Paper text:
ATAD2 was proposed from computational druggability analysis to be less tractable than BRD4, attributed in part to it lacking the hydrophobic region present in the BRD4 ligand binding site, termed the “WPF shelf”, interactions with which are postulated to contribute significantly to ligand binding affinity. We demonstrate the utility of FragLites in mapping the binding sites of bromodomain proteins BRD4 and ATAD2 and demonstrate that FragLite mapping is comparable to a full fragment screen in identifying ligand binding sites and key interactions.
The remaining hits for ATAD2 (13/16) and BRD4 (9/26) were bound in allosteric pockets of their respective proteins.
Numbering used by the authors: 40 to 168
Write the structure that this text describes.
Amino acid sequence: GSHMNPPPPETSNPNKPKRQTNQLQYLLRVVLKTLWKHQFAWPFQQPVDAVKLNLPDYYKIIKTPMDMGTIKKRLENNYYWNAQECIQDFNTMFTNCYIYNKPGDDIVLMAEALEKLFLQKINELPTEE
């Protein structure tokens, strides 16, 4: 873990109130599960390692990083209070990709495939009970 990469997003903080909701359970069991196993998931399964990729400007451009490895930790370690927080994390991850990369770059096509799946699943996010 290089000093030239930022610290990853917070995934543990006892002072932040936590809750299980049926919607968060769906995000873990249906949404994350579906996206994680996708053929195009691998660039998104951990924070962008700008040193290893030789992208020294990455964290100059992307000031709100997010990735599915972080989201998986947040879901598995009950970090969230509600589904909107987690949906926002997914949307941040996609937008980072679209902002940093050229349209039509392979990673953008990969992100777009995952986002299409994401949208289908979120359209079916259950009513909160």
